Ligand binder design. Structure first.
Ligand SMILES: CC[C@H](C(=O)N1CCCC[C@H]1C(=O)O[C@H](CCc1ccc(OC)c(OC)c1)c1cccc(OCC(=O)O)c1)c1cc(OC)c(OC)c(OC)c1
Length: 267
């Protein structure tokens, strides 16, 4: 059974998610759009990107469709604007949680800087359509262009397909957000003992939630599947943070908020 303290934990996380996650993306406006030996090998590899088409449905029924060159610099401003919009909701999600507010302001910044990418992938997975390969963001749509096995070779795209195949509830998604946010091993945290105890309570609640609501054999080892996926997300987070910071050093693109979460000072 679920204890009252565990039911209160989920209720505060779900209430935090409802107040800070605009699932319809109705407040995402005024965003930019694409215009109308070694190291060379890394620069070429970092500037690869997936072939994703963009759709913008107008309120009057009109549709704008963008198809990328069948380089990625034309797509960086728009992706940075969506990143900032997602980051604003994530930061708001953390500051409405009582457990996060009670931490020192330096540990709040350290936790947010280490989990902003992971919480963005977790929220974006809830709007991902695995059958059509499309991220439906309100009037915006991001469709993967043509196969699937070769596209599932990229770890982040493979993470999105695997996490969607688990068919998780909204409460399980918001508990992965809490486990990722309250990571005691993030660089710069000072209250590692408090954050570690909080993460363990979030993980126990997720484990108890799965056992009390998913008795089917298809959900066997589901908690361990989720924990292993959250570990892979931290590795994707560390790998793609390095890729973006190498792109920023060549072609600056990061917004002010993205610079703060990356540690960029402006020199
Ligand atoms: C928090 C950092 C951010 C990111 O992760 N965000 C934020 C934007 C949407 C969600 C997610 C993402 O990217 O979701 C996309 C799917 C949704 C999407 C698709 C195309 C878009 O536009 C054409 C777009 O526009 C909003 C949004 C995704 C999913 C899986 C693998 C992906 O890349 C794998 C790879 O190429 O290595 C990408 C990011 C910014 C980048 O530059 C500013 C970037 O440089 C390219 C990048 O590379 C990975 C990531």
């Amino acid at each position: 059974g679920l204890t009252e303290e565990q039911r209160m934990m989920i209720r505060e996380l779900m209430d935090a998610q409802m107040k800070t996650f605009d699932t319809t993306f109705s407040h995402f406006k005024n965003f930019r759009l694409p215009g109308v030996a070694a190291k060379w090998s890394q620069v070429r590899k970092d500037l690869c990107s997936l072939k994703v088409s963009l759709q913008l449905r107008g309120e009057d029924g009109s549709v704008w469709n963008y198809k990328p060159p069948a380089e990625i610099f034309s797509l960086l401003p728009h992706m940075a604007d969506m990143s900032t919009y997602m980051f604003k909701g994530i930061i708001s999600f953390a500051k409405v949680i009582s457990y996060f507010r009670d931490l020192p302001i330096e540990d709040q910044i350290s936790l947010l800087k280490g989990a902003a990418f992971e919480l963005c992938q977790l929220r974006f997975n809830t709007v991902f359509n695995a059958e059509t390969g499309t991220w439906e963001c309100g009037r915006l749509s991001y469709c993967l262009e043509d196969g699937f096995q070769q596209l599932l070779l990229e770890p982040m795209l493979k993470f999105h397909y695997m996490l969607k195949k688990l068919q998780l509830h909204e409460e399980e998604y918001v508990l992965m957000q809490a486990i990722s946010l309250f990571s005691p091993d993030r660089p710069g945290v000072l209250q590692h003992r408090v954050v570690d105890q909080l993460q363990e309570q979030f993980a126990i609640t997720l484990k108890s939630y799965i056992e009390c609501n998913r008795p089917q054999p298809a959900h066997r080892f589901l908690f361990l599947k989720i924990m292993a996926m959250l570990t892979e997300l931290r590795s994707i987070n560390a790998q793609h943070t390095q890729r973006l910071l190498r792109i920023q050093d060549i072609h600056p693109f990061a917004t002010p908020l993205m610079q703060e979460l990356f540690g960029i000072t402006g020199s």
